Amino acid sequence: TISNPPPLISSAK
Amino acid sequence: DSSESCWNCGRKASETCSGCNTARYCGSFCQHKDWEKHHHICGQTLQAQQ
Ligand SMILES: [Zn+2]
Ligand SMILES: [Zn+2]
User: Fold this and answer.
1) Is A11 in CB contact (< 8 Å) with chain B?
2) CB of A2 less than 8 A from some CB of B
3) Where are the zinc fingers (MYND-type) (chain B)?
4) Measured CA distances, B19 to A4, B1, B9 (Å)
5) Sign of the C-alpha dihedral, residues B45, B47, A4, A1?
6) Which residue segments constitute the domains of chain B, with CATH numbers given?
7) Cβ of B49: how many Cβ atoms within 10 Å?
8) CB-based burial, A1-13: b 16+ in 10 Å, e otherwise
9) Is residue B3 left, alpha or beta, with left meaning phi > 0 and alpha meaning psi from -120 to 50?
10) What are the start-end ranges of the E strands in chain B?
11) Are A8 and B18 within 8 A, CB to CB?
């Protein structure tokens, strides 16, 4: 029951 | 191991919270699980003045 958190960023090299 | 680990699961994470650029999660569900706790931190600057 909480707002919507920012988007996630996937990192990989 | 220290930076590479899901803040929720507790094993490993490949995603990063673009909001604070500090949180890490391996799945959309993982971020939501800890969201209740993490959100208190995310965004930086604690709610005190104004
Ligand atoms: Zn996870
Ligand atoms: Zn965050």
Assistant:
1) yes
2) yes
3) 6-42
4) 11, 23, 19
5) positive
6) 1-50 (6.10.140.2220)
7) 5
8) eeeebeebeeeee
9) alpha
10) 15-17, 24-25
11) yes
